[PDB]
């Protein structure tokens, strides 16, 4: 599962853990096996403006 | 290069196109001093350092 | 997103990679290779995971 968020939101992406994002966007069951591999992207996906 | 070291280079003869710099949209300082940034297309030089 | 913006307000891609481990047959294996088949004799075993 692929997507994009900002850096605050990172420590959301884990089992148990509450925010916008575990409540409306993405939610992690709290039986969850597997990896979280987050990087920076700030080339690729921000533009000046 | 480190800043120690920092790269120059020199540009001269050739046409110079500076509409390549100013519609990037990565650049966050585009700071120019004693030459307005929107008309560097517009005048001559004869050397410049990088 | 913007360059200028702090880490909190910077852009991160995640990936997310959920593992199932059902009764199914294992399709989803390391770079471990296959060893030779020695029967009759006690061996440690790795059969498809």
Redesign the interface.
């Not at chain 3, 200028?4 to 991160?12: H, I, L």
């Given at each position: 599962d692929s997507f994009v968020i900002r850096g605050d939101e990172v420590r959301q992406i884990a089992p148990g853990q509450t925010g916008k994002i575990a409540d409306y966007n993405y939610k992690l069951p709290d039986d969850f096996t597997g990896c979280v591999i987050a990087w920076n992207s700030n080339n690729l996906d921000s533009k000046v403006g | 290069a480190s800043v120690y070291a920092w790269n120059r280079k020199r540009i001269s003869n050739c046409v110079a196109d500076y509409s390549v710099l100013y519609n990037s949209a990565s650049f966050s300082t585009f700071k120019c001093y004693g030459v307005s940034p929107t008309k560097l297309n517009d005048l001559c030089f004869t050397n410049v350092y990088a | 997103?913007?360059?200028?913006?702090?880490?909190?307000?910077?852009?991160?891609?995640?990936?997310?990679?959920?593992?199932?481990?059902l009764h199914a047959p294992a399709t989803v294996c390391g770079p471990k290779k296959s060893t030779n088949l020695v029967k009759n004799k006690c061996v440690n075993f790795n059969f498809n995971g």
């Open positions: - | - | 997103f913007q360059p200028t913006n702090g880490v909190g307000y910077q852009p991160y891609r995640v990936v997310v990679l959920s593992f199932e481990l």
